[PDB]
Design an enzyme around this catalytic site. Sequence first.
Site: not given
Lengths: 337, 334
Positions: B90, B157, B160, B185
């Site tokens: 980004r 994820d 985690r 996501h």
Amino acid sequence: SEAAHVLITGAAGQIGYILSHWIASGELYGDRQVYLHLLDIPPAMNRLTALTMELEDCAFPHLAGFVATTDPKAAFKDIDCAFLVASMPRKPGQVRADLISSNSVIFKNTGEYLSKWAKPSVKVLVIGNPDNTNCEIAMLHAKNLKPENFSSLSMLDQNRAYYEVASKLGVDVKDVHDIIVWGNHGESMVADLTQATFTKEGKTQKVVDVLDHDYVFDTFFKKIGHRAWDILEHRGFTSAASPTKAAIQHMKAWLFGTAPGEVLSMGIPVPEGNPYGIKPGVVFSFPCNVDKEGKIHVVEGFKVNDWLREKLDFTEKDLFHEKEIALNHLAQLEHHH
Amino acid sequence: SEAAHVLITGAAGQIGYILSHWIASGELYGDRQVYLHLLDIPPAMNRLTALTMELEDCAFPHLAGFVATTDPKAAFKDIDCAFLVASMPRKPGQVRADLISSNSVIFKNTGEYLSKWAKPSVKVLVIGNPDNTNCEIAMLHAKNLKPENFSSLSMLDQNRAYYEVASKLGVDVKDVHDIIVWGNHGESMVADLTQATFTKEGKTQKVVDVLDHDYVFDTFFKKIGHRAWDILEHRGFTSAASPTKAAIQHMKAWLFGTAPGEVLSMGIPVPEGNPYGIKPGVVFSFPCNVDKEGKIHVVEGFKVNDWLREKLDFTEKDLFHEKEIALNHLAQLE
């Protein structure tokens, strides 16, 4: 089983980052769990916290737990093995003698922490440079430990040498045998090809009978001797994954034994009985194997030609000199107090 | 056996550095050798050379060789699997639509390269963000490949979430079961605890029956949602070892199959007739297993309560919207 307790010093650095994850993944201790003691200095503690968060976020089944700390007792308490990665880097304008001197204090303190807090069975692998001399100093200052508790890492240089020779000969690394790195690190290290053999197309020959003398006894050591600098030139930082690979490889062999025919260069306190004419009193890289009980043995039967004799003698002399520098520095600090 | 050819894009970066060495160590393909294809962009070539030098200096018995290149054909030729790590980051003042748009071109081109040059059996794991949509776009533009060749990474994820929940409960990770990451996501990801159980003192209980509502349905997702940022704040750089761990975990499962009882969240092209009411046409994270033939299957038997239904619907809608942004951008360029 109770988890094995593993110390990594300098844990916030790049080697520590990779090593901790690699060990936590199960590669060192097999089915047994590991508990990581991760030591660094206060300014590094945020980076160490970041490391532990990533370890957590792997959900490693082998990871029983960890402690990230700046405190020696917490780091060394009841450890089974240690990767002594941290060391003092050379300062601008310092020479090798000053590098040895600055590290002597560190490694004296570390030997004292090991003796005080580690298990009597601890296996201490010294990686931070100058590793042979740091290892000697730590051992001399570890009153409740023994020579069998200490070694230093020469497998990075061995691995480098294998790839170079295999590439030069146009074979796989598995088809080259009995390359050895003897003695000290630094300028005096002996990258010995005089024992080495290779198999190509079903013919086994001696490496030095096929390769040019100028390659073997000049170019080859130059390539090996400068390799680290070439990576730093391209990478912007020193090597990390490759010393980590070698470190794990050494420790795993030390813990559980080497494979049939396997010869690993390892820095060890010189054994009194050794068959290569090296004097006791320093830590010296030898061709080694390790038995199933985790005991290191110098491999017998290698030949010492006139070239190798001279190289061995020179690196032996170099190690005793480095030891003298380190011990003298410590004595001068004590005198000044 | 002939070496397996393994592509890593973004190879000079931190993930590439660790992933390359991990794979060259033998951890992915077992006894089989690996031939690494290491792709990056022209200004990264010196770092890429440095990576190759360290790989060499490991004397890995499993490493048959490597290509290190900026050339797509050399990178994609005859590959068996791919770790698509690289993507366009980004830019400062950019919004999500712009991130999707910029990456759509990259992933269109990548799908074309895969179809043109990779083996028809290539296993493509999309990691670079936005991974579900990047995966969809690559697949749509890979004319000689099929949906079974593509997946995206949601295991970081999942891992985690397991850590977080086991730590909150005071149990080992191995004593927590059936946590699932569903959907996209980003903000619409569904970190589902409604199936999950844990054991302690001889009792197995549902997580949602023991932990407080405010933790399960607010605090927990925020923790999972801010984890990457927290690491970046402490590390000075984004995560590298933990996504690498998850990537190898996913790929190894995909190659050889999962273990009995194992449920791995994986982004996959949505299967027609999946049992969770998700519409075909996007790549969506599901609870999966993998059979011994390396085929991914959605795990049946989970329950969809009202909360989960709404979450699943919202992330499905989000995925279709990202796909529309990507496809509209590509169409405007054509």
